[PDB]
């Protein structure tokens, strides 16, 4: 459930990257991600 | 209370997969070797079911080495197991193809993919393929069908011999029907060599007969003489290793729906 | 079905007469029997092929490992107790269930190969006897079987464990190029970093489509006898084909990390999960307490493997063909780096200067 | 005569503690008594991307937004410790006035105590070992990390074939130039350069406490280099002017993960936990997205002590050192940093030089004899682990040649019959009936 | 084609089928000059 | 500090093999009143037995139960007493056979004459299930059958013996001593005409523990069957028979307690052998010839 | 009874009880199985000093012994707990075989490579322990007693001794033991008959598919077992079921001739390879 | 030096590989460590 | 023997027995393996193979 | 733990003497002229110690010609004599 | 330790012609030099 991330609050932290944030999901620094470009109307559907 | 084996889930067991492990609370578990921590890659029989040239008996020679163990409870990231104390009762789960009945002796066998190919809660090539806790008289029966199919496996070119095999893999027991190499070399070394080497030993022994049985037994290079008898007896040892199925349980009573049965543990 | 195949006649039609073609046709009439190669190399007569001996070399090595501040949270619990009863020596097993949630976004740690402690391998030139590797395969004739197994392969160690394997290759193959630069001994370089991060048919096009070009040379195949699917390197040194066939799984094989089709198709998962696969499934080590070289049985250390499974290249060491070349390399105190060729000879330079570095240390 | 049984010199065990060791600056140890009840732990992250478009006619992306869940992997431990039943027998039985009651009572007590004390020692060292193995199994090697830093920065999407080809070239070059680093003779300044390269190419994680793991002076550490004996002392002897022994504050206790009154009913209701729930629910009855000031892993009331550590300074980033053989001496288990690394070599033997294009460099040095033993490159020479020349040939290679798996063709028949003719029209013509 | 040195392999369009033939190269010279060149055979003759 | 102080608690639970069984039974006997079936190292099981099978075993208590693999799919598992298959074996006198054929046979059995004598013993239809205690006569007989351990009254009031009938016992009674005495169970065939013979059953006691030294004392007794076993090997080519003898452990008793007795049943009485302190302990099949 | 307190009854030494103090967990057989026994009965040595003294009578004797496990050796009291069938017990090694975890162990009479002092010949009485071998060495050493008794049937007087010496150096795991100069005894002879009878019936039941299986396999396959064994139809499967099954009656019996009693089944082996957790008497 | 470098790291009976490496360590260390005063010597090398 | 390889034997230091009989890599206590190293030539040779 | 073991509590009355020291490995190490206690005695200083060393070398060692060669041919140009072509002698310097 | 050795004095002059080093093994056809393991010629020339 990515809505539980993007709708609830979070924790402002310093992050780090090897290469790149959109390459982190295409070269797969992590698997089971979620990528979206237009601001998602799905999180507004509760 | 009893012995304890913890299983560390190297793979992520989803709560729905835990929902299938929390249904198998009674079921047996093939463990490779007794140790308190084991991986999920260790636990189960999938490390035995895996080779391009792996034969039924060779898997059965491996599973005979594997310690039988019983599921106790699945707590999330862990599976708790109990190596069963000999002589105690245990609620094991009938995950074989055969309904059990009150008083029967149960034998562990490797699951056969002949018409009943089955897996489990699998993730990343590890499932928990579970041995057929089968009745003992059918366990010897299944063994004999596998060897006789393999003894007839070379003469596929006759259709009548193929029609002899066509009856042969039909295995039918109470409320259950299922379909089913050096061991057959071991059968043939005993069949041919005992035909030739006994004749110089029956005619010498048949004079003195204490039990009075050598009389109709006749009705039925010394280096190479012993070389036959050495490779006679050692092949008899090789077949008896893969015949005596080492009985595993004794079902006292069966739980209804035939999912479970209280089984006093033997051997 | 003819005994005389086409290159006999298509050699004789352009042969050079007068005492050399007359005899070299009769030398082209040397049999290709296994016992023929046996008696042939036994008398030192070079048979009609050239083989490439491959070899691993185990280096016990200090590996330094940075790790960032408060990288991964080792969540733990209370170490609980259980009691197994062994009837005169009771054993309390005690356990601590721990998970480790991941570090941050990036990798918060790094390993660095720093200091060679030992070389467990001897860098020896032993041979991997396939009579012992495949113990089942004998010949159909009793007499030929006994002649071969008395011809070869019918307690002692001084430099650590002996290491070897084998590939057969055509005697044309460029020592002038291909062996100078570090490669795949399959003949065709099959590196998964070159191919797309998931495309299995493209990866099979890298390995076995020889009408597809080779990476990193574009000479599409160096050994056709050992690069193709069902080539001689493939039917023997792939473990998939070697396991179709009847072998002993105990022996280590430095060829397997090249010739295994499926174990290098499985190294085609998403460039970072590629290196996470390199860290996870690095449990094919060599057992410590053995004279020869048998694989590890139950792990206990995710060792850093070689560039194979990652870069799919094997190194070359210094390889002088004649001792003329070798003694001109090591005349006095000199390097093992000179590439020098006498007319029928060669000196293949070492890539990592181990004969310099281990001498230095 | 006499035997002189002198003083039995019972060498007392050297104690360890996980938080006292230098690996705990990379660890973050948290007690959670329902870890035996979790599935996993899967921290989700919301990353607003660094957003830019520009220009006129440049293809402008729309506003990318990333959400990313990281999982937890277990590595739980069990040691045994045995007590003899004959040892327990006198603690059960407890005779009246008898050497046994006087000495072996307390000696069975002390055998038990020694078992528990070596048990706590092995629990701490197994925690050391598992945290070190999680670091090693989740630490890619340095040349890999260097290449991913270097040639992977600009590549936005999934990486292109040409790009990842240069990535392969980068791994190759960095591995060849950058293997056996301390074994290779390098300058003090050049080793400082490479440690700058390590600590820069690594990525400093999410959790960062200003209170703990700071040097006296408010100067916070950035992780630890852990190593073995020879490499630690060579680093010390190289960089001894920069390595200053200092007591560093460290947590003297574990963090805690708590399940709320709410949160237990949550885990019952739908089998999950959201951490920091009431700190979400106050935001619910407030305006929603006001980010939380003290996370469940960041609000830690950790007690603290100090331990004397060898810190250093690379990349202007303070890094501790660790000589973990202090906890691995006399132990059964080898150091996971003492790591065998095998490497595969190849070479040709018997490989006919193409004589038409042939030549001889170094004929000034070489004077071989015009014999076909010299003209065919039949044998090949080499050095062992030491400099022992070692001859190889087909004669020694007979053990692999004469085997019948060479002169079988069954699998080769099968592969050639399966993989049929490729669709080259020369082949399509050459399809013929003659044999 | 050249899967194996000692054995030769090609398809043969029989009565409705391209059957493979695994026919053993019996002599050392049955390899092509592409694999066992003319100078290599001459030089091997000198070795004998 | 912390670690070792917790491990003292898991150490110092002495003087018992676990003190996990004994203590936690008491905390459920304080909870629920004094609980029966808890002070019981022996092992039992409750079985649904019909009224037509309910006899003997009901009246005189402590006796073997046997499962059937009857070749009919619907009643495929019929309970058999050690008294019951005396109407199958050749050993049993025809009066002794028809004594108990008239006890069981009252309009709910005599299929089981016709589907044990007719549907022959392959020595795999019978399974040594165990011995009884505490029959429950009601709408359905409900036999608590012991599996491993002694047969006894609840409250540990009386050891229930093993009721071995006389005809099945004295033809393989062992030697005379005063030791522990293992009860084995032996099925021997006399392969004469009728594809199995008249499958002869035996309750054999012996001081001998070991396997092949025990079948050697059967190689004394069974030559009459063994010479017939060799006979059908050549009397039928193509058809073969199976096992000559079939040995399995059944239990043991204290061997000074071996004394004769009688049951007092319907259709006359029946002379038995009463083996008092009978620890039931089922063993595996030893097929031999 | 289970716990067996043992009288020593001889004049033992400090050097005696120091050896058994490190041997706690060894296997001692007792014949009588009381709670209180004396060392005349306790121990196996008191019957291996017989005057005939062949493997034929010692092996058949000690299957009436009852094995015990050495416990609580201080001074003059020997606690011997009689093991129960199916609990886990650890066993200290008495004979140099590493026992190879996961297999069945048995009871071997005595080393019989000479007469080993099992503890110390105290007052001309040592306490000798059985060998506990992993059932492969047990069956093989019992095989060769009948191999060389079948040999002496059809040999004159020397090709026995030229072929027993071929077969008596049994090179097993960690051990090269010796057949005890094979004496032809009647316990072998009563059972060598039934073996020869069991070989006869397998020839009867071999119904020309089980016969010709190797001789059909050599035409098609080239295997190591297939080539070493070169020197060394009907539509009735239901009858072949019964003939193969009756053949399986014989081979489970003729193995049981030369096999021994299954005994201590290995739970775990220490890395010292000396103390071995074992179940299943 | 050979023993400090390899030997007490393991505690069991010395491995067939390890003691062979110990012999090689004796060879290398002896041939580089015989006659220190007579061989070339830095003050730093002497203090090391 | 005059044919003996200075390449394979004489430039490096070795046992002048011809067969390397160093007792530091062998099974130490095993006198049978020791004689297998020294005088058994069907056994392979240490340090040269 | 015994706080006074009998070896451990060997109380020794103390004096001083001028000795050499070295700071090596942060472990202070003294030196000793042992010559000055073996001065003019028959027993030599055992630290002075003969160290025997075995040296082998071949002579008359034929080389197979088909793999034979000659490097250092710029250094050497013999007489073409079979006395040069077989090894017969072997030369080596002494101590000096 | 296989010492410094020359089969011929030609090789021996190639080794020690002047202040040169020793271990050059440098085979001629039947002539061979053997390099010393320890540089004893250099160490006794030096010290």
Author numbering:
A (entry chain E): 4 to 49
B (entry chain a): 1 to 180, 194 to 233, 265 to 311
C (entry chain m): 968 to 1121, 1146 to 1352
D (entry chain m): 50 to 484
E (entry chain m): 533 to 580
F (entry chain S): 6 to 294
G (entry chain W): 2 to 233, 262 to 310
H (entry chain n): 195 to 242
What did the published study say regarding this structure?
The structural components within an asymmetric unit encompass 1/5 of a penton capsomer, 2.5 hexon capsomers (1 P hexon, 1 C hexon, and 1/2 of an E hexon), 5 and 1/3 triplexes/pM32 dimers (Ta, Tb, Tc, Td, Te, and 1/3 Tf). To overcome the aforementioned problem of weakened densities and limited resolutions, we have used a sub-particle reconstruction strategy to obtain structures of the MCMV capsid and its associated pM32 at near atomic resolutions and also built atomic models for tegument protein pM32 and all capsid proteins. In total, we have built atomic models of 55 unique conformers, including 16 MCP, 16 SCP, 5 Tri1, 5 Tri2A, 5 Tri2B and 8 pM32nt, amounting to over 27,000 amino acid residues. As detailed below, the atomic models of pM32 of MCMV and pUL32 of HCMV differ, though those for their capsid proteins are similar, with root-mean-square deviation (RMSD) distances between corresponding capsid protein models ranging from 1.95 to 3.36Å (2.47 Å for penton MCP, 2.09 Å for hexon MCP, 1.95 Å for SCP, 3.36 Å for Tri1, 2.05 Å for Tri2A, and 2.10 Å for Tri2B). All bound pM32s are dimerized in MCMV and can be classified into two types, either pM32-a (cyan) or pM32-b (orange-red), based on their relative locations on the capsid. The subunits of pM32nt dimers cluster on each triplex and lean against two neighboring MCPs. pM32nt-a and pM32nt-b are similar in structure (the magnitude of RMSD is 1.20 Å) and form a “Λ”-shape configuration. Careful comparison of the atomic model of pM32 dimer and the corresponding pUL32 subunits in HCMV (for example, pM32 and pUL32 dimer from triplex Te regions) reveals that 17 residues in the pM32-pM32 interface are within 3 Å of each other, as opposed to only 4 residues at the pUL32-pUL32 interface. The existence of 13 additional residues at the molecular interface of the pM32 dimer indicates a stronger and more rigid pM32-pM32 association than between pUL32-pUL32, which is congruent with the pairwise presence/absence of pM32 subunits on MCMV capsid.
